[PDB]
Each structure stands twice: as C-alpha cells, then as structure tokens.
C-alpha cells in the first residue's frame, strides 16, 4: 500500500467561516391584509410551513456572540425598513410657527401640574391666500419657551422638520426569519448552558432562524425568549466594567401599562390633500400613566440573578442595585411603544435593594412624547399622531441590561445599574446561538486507485 | 431497496463521521449546492448571482482535470509523502474531512497545479495516438 495516488472527491462535508447577505422570510398568515405594518413583510418570501433541521453528531464548533456579523445586518435592515415606511407620509414643515400656550388646569391631580399646555396658532389652509386659527394640546416635553401666555415653539424647529407617521400603519412587531443563500449554511448551538463564547459541543444546521420579533426598548427586554434551565449571565469580559452584561430570565415577569386618559382626535387640513391630526379636549379626568409589576414575583427573580452573579465575584461579596446614573431621557428611563404611544417610565422602584452574603404591586410613573428620535440619529425626527380612547397593554419581561461601577480594590461590595442605549444589544440577545459558514465541496485524498489509460 | 441502511440522511449529516463512512453520501451535499426596488430587492438577486458563479467556478476545475460529470474520480498523480506520511488505515478510519482539511491546507495549490499538467499531457498523447492511426 505504498503506490498511493491522488483521488478527487466532489461533495464533501467541510466548511469555513464567512460573511454574506441574508434575506427575510415572513409567515403566510401575514399576507391576510395587514399590509399596514412598518415591517414590510409584503416583499418577504413566504416561509416553509415545515422547517427542516439536521443534527450533526460528533461535531464541536466555536462561537463568538460578540463578533457576530448577523447582528450588524439586522440593524441596517431594521433602520432601512423604518426609513422606507415613512416616505409616503406628510411632512410637517408649516408646523414650525410661534405658539401661544397656557397651562391646562381643569380637573387634574397634583402630579400632572404643568405637564400639558393649551396652545393656539395660525395655520395655512387648502387655499394659498387665506389662513386659519387653530388650537391643540401639547406635552411639556415638546415645547420650548422663546424670549402672560408666553410664546413657545416645537423643540425640533432648530434642527430639522418632523414627518408625521401615517395613521394607518401599525407598529406591532411581526416575527421574521433570516435565511441563507445556496452554498451557505447556518449552525445552531443546542447546548442549554452555553455562555455565548467558546466551544459548543452540541450543534445542528438549519436554513432559517426562528421567528425574531423586532421589539425596541431599553433597560428591559420584552416579549423575548427564555432560558431553559437557569438564569444566564453573558458578557464580553466580565472583569472589565466598561462592558455591558446581558441577563436572560428563567421565567417571565408580567408588566401592565396604561394611559388612563380618554383622548380625542381632530383633523386639520393644512394643504391640498394633507391633514395634521391634533389633540382636542380630554373627556373626563386627567391622571398620570404608569406600569405595574408584582412585588413578590420581582423579588424572587432578583434573588436568582444574585445567586448566579456571585459565581464571578465570590460568595462573600455584597450585591446592591441602584438606578441609572444620568444622561438623556432615552437612556435613564425604560422606553417602549405600547399600541401607538411612546412611554418613558421611571424604573427607580425596581433597582433598590442590597443583598448580603448569607399581593401588592410596584407602580412606575411614566411620561409620554410625540417627537421621537430613533436609532440615536440626529436630524431626523418623527411625529406620532394621537390615539383615541384609553390604552392598555400587557407583556413579559424577559431579560435585563446592566452595568458595573468601578470600585477601588475589593471593597466586598458591587453595585449594578441599568443601562441601555445601543439597540444592537437587543438583537444580540436573540442571535447569540447562530453563525454563518461557507461550504467547500472539494477534497483530495490518497488511495490505491489509478486512472486507466 | 434499503440502500445502505442508514439511521438517517441529510445535508452535512456526516460531518462528524470518518472519511470512509462520509464518502457514501456525496450526492446528499452535491444536490443542495444550487437551490437547496425595495430593501429586499437586491438582497435576493446578488445572492443568486453569487451562488451561480461559485457553482460554475467549482465545475470548471473538475472540467480541466478530466473529472467532469463524476463524484469520485481517479487521477494519475502519485502521492508525495511530504504532504502526509500517515497510513491508509488511520486516514480513512480515524479522521474526518474537517480534520483532514486542516492538515493538508498548505499543499492544496501544488496538487491543483499538478493535476492540470497531467491532464494536458494525457490529452496531447491521446491526440498523437489517434493521429497515428
């Protein structure tokens, strides 16, 4: 067996890491009307009703959750869809005008004092010659005084012009599946104790990921996926305090949010075939918006998180939780979108505790806004039309985003505070078990066969 | 019939098996290498074009080595012990294609070059022989 020769094999199972462009695939049920959705699943290919998955025995692979190129592509696609859904909508250039505002003091509690303003202004009409005098209600977070009934202006007038969101389109998230082209593949890690980095001893290959809902929020991961066995803590470098920590819950925690104001909508014609939806009067009483969580359920979940955090810091260290340090409203509060409106809740009653080495509810006051700056961009804003009637939504808390404070030496105390901001960490919490590889179906090996002349 | 009597078959299903056992399922991976103005306007077209180009590029190499239209093709180039001195038993019964690829990744281009010239010589000699008649 010394007269060995080269033999060529086509179609061998080997692969290499690669970066390519994936394409979406939405469910067929999404085609039943409901074309009014920001996530334009109209152009998404229908999914396979029966997905196929192959188990890869004896195969060990290396994953790096913090250098995944799938995350970068998802961010760009989400931003592009957001921008594209706003092109055929009204542009509110003429709304940049001096306003004459006064406080709304009519059946209000002591906490809603100075939060609503009643402004009136001149507006253009469908005819280019004449103008109209109108009025509307604005939140105190969208108006800035310029120098009784002092005169204000919209906060964005000196940076850009807002685009009104088309009232028919809906913001409800819809599951999306990412699929790879021919000649590529996606590997999935089935280990239940995977910590995001290192070798995964249980692997399998698929052609499309499971349905991922693009939910936007900060400080709290909503309507996500749950761990199978235990609370999972993941970080790029646990010993470095400049890196965020991701937490995945073992069980869900319910949160109830509502806006207890019966709002009214008005239509104002500002041009030929163009309308601006203002806020009329409020029918009834005026009260603050809030969110509810169960005190008992939250306490249990925090206890499990502490137990899994001591493994990286020792059994004889004090663990304490504190609220955010500072920054803009979008970073120091738990932001989210609940059926059209945009909330900014004060999560300072959640992170208030200290843990030693050894029925009721929590109410979080929230505010509301109408001028939205998404994706941390500058120069592009959006205007959210008012919603008529009362609002109520329910969802599950699935994880967290935390941050550690640099302490001198080992003071036996560690303090963690919530922190969000970058929206890539939201996608990273769902695509942590996937990677893209490239197939190489050509191999050469020695054998005893020889070509016949 | 019962074929080879396998527990199950699928794409890349034999990645963890010995090179001897994984050589009986080449068609499974071979048949899935071709198909198996909005945002998604070009993300669907460029991928298809790239897949076609890669497939054709792979096919051309087999074409110029004389192994067109085949899954297992024997050649006329002797194996050089410098590339690997391992036995024939510890290669086909104690290694997987993923491992084997790493070992001989350095010498791939040399073998690719040798095969081309072997085929060229074969073609020239065949033409001469036919011309003699």
């Amino acid at each position, epitope marked *: 067996a010394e007269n060995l020769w080269v033999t060529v094999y086509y179609g061998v199972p080997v692969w290499k890491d690669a970066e390519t462009t994936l394409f979406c695939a939405s469910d067929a049920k999404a085609y039943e009307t409901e074309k009014h959705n920001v996530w334009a699943t109209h152009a998404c290919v229908p999914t*396979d*009703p*029966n*997905p*196929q*998955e*192959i*188990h890869l*025995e004896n195969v060990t692979e290396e994953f790096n959750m913090w250098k995944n190129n799938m995350v970068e592509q998802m961010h760009t696609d989400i931003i592009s869809l957001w921008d594209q859904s706003l092109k055929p909508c009204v542009k509110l250039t003429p709304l940049c005008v001096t306003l004459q505002c006064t406080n709304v003091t009519n059946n209000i509690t002591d906490d809603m004092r100075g939060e609503l303003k009643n402004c009136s202004f001149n507006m253009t009409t469908e005819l280019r010659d004449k103008k109209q005098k109108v009025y509307s209600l604005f939140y105190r977070l969208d108006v800035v005084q310029i120098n009784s009934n002092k005169e204000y202006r919209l906060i964005n007038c000196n940076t850009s012009a807002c685009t009104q969101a088309c009232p028919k389109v809906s913001f409800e998230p819809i599951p999306i599946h990412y699929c790879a082209p021919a000649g590529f593949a996606i590997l999935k890690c089935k280990d239940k104790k995977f910590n995001g980095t290192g070798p995964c001893p*249980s692997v399998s290959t698929v052609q499309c990921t499971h349905g991922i809902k693009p939910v936007v929020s900060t400080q709290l991961l909503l309507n996500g996926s749950l761990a199978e066995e235990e609370v999972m803590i993941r970080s790029e470098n646990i010993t470095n305090n400049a890196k965020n920590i991701l937490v995945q819950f073992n069980t869900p925690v319910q949160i109830n949010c509502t806006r207890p104001n019966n709002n009214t909508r008005k239509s104002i014609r500002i041009g030929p075939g163009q309308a601006f939806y203002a806020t009329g009067d409020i029918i009834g009483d005026i009260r603050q918006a809030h969110c509810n969580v169960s005190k008992a359920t939250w306490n249990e979940t925090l206890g499990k998180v502490v137990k899994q955090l001591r493994k990286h810091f020792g059994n004889n260290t004090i663990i304490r939780f504190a609220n955010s340090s500072g920054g803009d409203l979008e970073v120091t509060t738990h932001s989210f979108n609940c059926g059209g409106e945009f909330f900014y809740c004060n999560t300072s009653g959640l992170f208030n505790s200290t843990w030693i080495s050894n029925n009721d509810s929590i109410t979080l006051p929230c505010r509301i806004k109408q001028i939205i700056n998404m994706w941390q961009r500058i120069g592009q804003c959006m205007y959210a039309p008012p919603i008529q009637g009362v609002i109520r939504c329910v969802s599950n808390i699935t994880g967290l985003i935390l941050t550690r404070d640099g302490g001198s030496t080992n003071s036996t105390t560690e303090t963690f505070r919530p922190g969000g901001g970058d929206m890539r960490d939201n996608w990273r919490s769902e695509l942590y078990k996937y990677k893209v590889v490239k197939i190489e179906p050509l191999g050469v090996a020695p054998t005893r066969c020889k070509r016949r002349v | *019939a*019962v*074929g*080879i*009597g*396998a*527990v*199950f*078959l*699928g794409f890349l299903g034999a990645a963890g*098996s*010995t090179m*001897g*056992a994984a050589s009986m399922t080449l068609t499974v991976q071979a048949r899935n290498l071709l198909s198996g103005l909005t945002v998604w306007g070009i993300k669907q077209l460029q991928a298809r074009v790239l897949a076609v180009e890669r497939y054709l590029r792979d096919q051309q190499l087999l074409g110029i080595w004389g192994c067109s239209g085949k899954l297992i093709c024997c050649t006329n180039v002797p194996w050089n012990s410098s590339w690997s001195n391992r036995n024939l038993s510890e290669i086909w019964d104690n290694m997987t294609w993923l491992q084997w690829d790493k070992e001989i990744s350095n010498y791939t281009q040399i073998i690719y070059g040798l095969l081309e010239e072997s085929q060229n010589q074969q073609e020239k000699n065949e033409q001469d022989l036919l011309a003699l008649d």
Partner: antibody, heavy 120, light 106 residues
C-alpha cells in the same frame, strides 16, 4: 416468522454494569438499522441509541452519552447494549426496534421487551 | 425537540361506535407521522405510517388523516380486542419523538 427477543435482565446495584442482547431471526439482519427504546413507568417512549446497518456509525442520547455502548454482530444476528454507571433514572422496559428502508425511518418490527431494575 | 401532545388522556367508548384520538405537534412535521399500538405484555405493532397509509396486516377499520401540526386517528368499529394504548411518532427532525399515549377503555 420475523421476531426479536431480548435477554439479560436482572438486579443491578447503582453504578453497576449490565449487558443486554436482542437476538433476531427470520430476515437479513445485516441489511437494516436498529434502535434501542425505553419506556419509564408512567412516561412515554424515549429514544436511547441507534446503529447503522454495517455497524460503522453509532448515535447516542445526551443523557446516556459516555455511559452506554451499542454494538452489533452480523455473523450471529445479534444486537448488544452495554450499560455502565447505572443510575436510578435508568428505570424502564427496553425494546430493540428495527428500521425499514433507506427513506422510511419509522420502525416496522419491535421486540418483546425486558425489564431492568436498580436497587441497593 | 418537537413535543408530541396526545389528547384525551383516557378515552372510554363502548363497542361499535366511533372513537377519535388527537396528536398535536409543536412544529410542522409535514406527513412524517406513524401510529403504534401496544397490548399489555406484547410487542408493539405498526398501524399507520405516513399519516394516511394503513400498515400491512392491520385491520381496515383503522383510519387516520391530517397534515402539518394536526393529526387524527379514527376506527370504524371498536372490537373487544381494540383495548390498548396508542402512541404517535414523528420522524421529521432528529431525534424521533413519541406522544404520551392515549389509553382506550372498552
């Protein structure tokens, strides 16, 4: 008449070892793949391990990986299952099923079944 | 791991009339489904394979249908010998999985 019979039952201490055999007769044994399946008392059927026709490929379940070994002997038309480091949860009746065809993965002929018990 | 759910847990039907069983799949398994019957103390038997084809040698009264994630088994007539446990198995994604098993009582 095609049929499979299991043997080797007995009493085994926790952490012990036990070997089972599933003799076959009435068909070409070396042309079909085999499986091992167990049913715990009060639970459903769960897959344990499998082996290819020629005995060149073996598959294991996560709970048994590293403790169980499966082998076959085409000459004597026999199937073997070697158990090591037994535990309490390994309580069930074990059936040696058979696979039919190269694309019909469902079983077509089961076995009588044998009962294995662990106690101190 | 696709999870097979079989309902009702226990079914009591007198001889002669209809008897229906349900097997629900947490994920689309196409038509790769089979039904098995096991008498107490006997070797289980194959009844339906492919979710629509009757197993060779089984009585014709047995009949099942369904695709995707919903499947059903129906027997034209219940005989004295039909008392047994029935389970569904899917062979779409490895590993194969079984249902909990529905008990039929005369």
């Amino acid at each position: 008449e095609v049929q499979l019979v299991e043997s080797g039952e007995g009493l085994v201490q926790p952490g012990g070892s036990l070997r089972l055999s599933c003799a076959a007769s009435g068909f070409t044994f070396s042309s079909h793949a085999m499986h091992w399946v167990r049913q715990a008392p009060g639970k459903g059927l769960e897959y344990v391990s499998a082996i290819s026709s020629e005995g060149g490929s073996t598959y294991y379940a996560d709970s048994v990986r590293g403790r169980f070994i499966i082998s076959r002997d085409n000459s004597k038309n026999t199937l073997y299952l070697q158990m090591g480091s037994l535990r309490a949860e390994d309580m069930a009746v074990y059936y040696c099923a058979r696979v039919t065809g190269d694309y019909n993965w469902y079983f077509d002929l089961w076995g009588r079944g044998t009962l294995v018990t662990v106690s101190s | 791991e696709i999870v097979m759910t079989q309902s009702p847990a226990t079914l009591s039907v007198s001889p002669g009339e209809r008897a229906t069983l349900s097997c629900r799949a947490s994920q689309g398994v196409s038509s790769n489904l089979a039904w098995y019957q096991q008498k107490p103390g006997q070797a289980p038997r194959l009844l339906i394979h492919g979710a629509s084809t009757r197993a060779t040698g089984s009585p014709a009264r047995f009949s099942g249908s369904g695709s995707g994630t919903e499947f059903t088994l129906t027997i034209s007539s219940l005989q004295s010998e039909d008392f047994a446990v029935y389970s569904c198995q899917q062979y779409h994604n490895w590993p194969w999985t079984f249902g909990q098993g529905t008990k039929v009582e005369i």
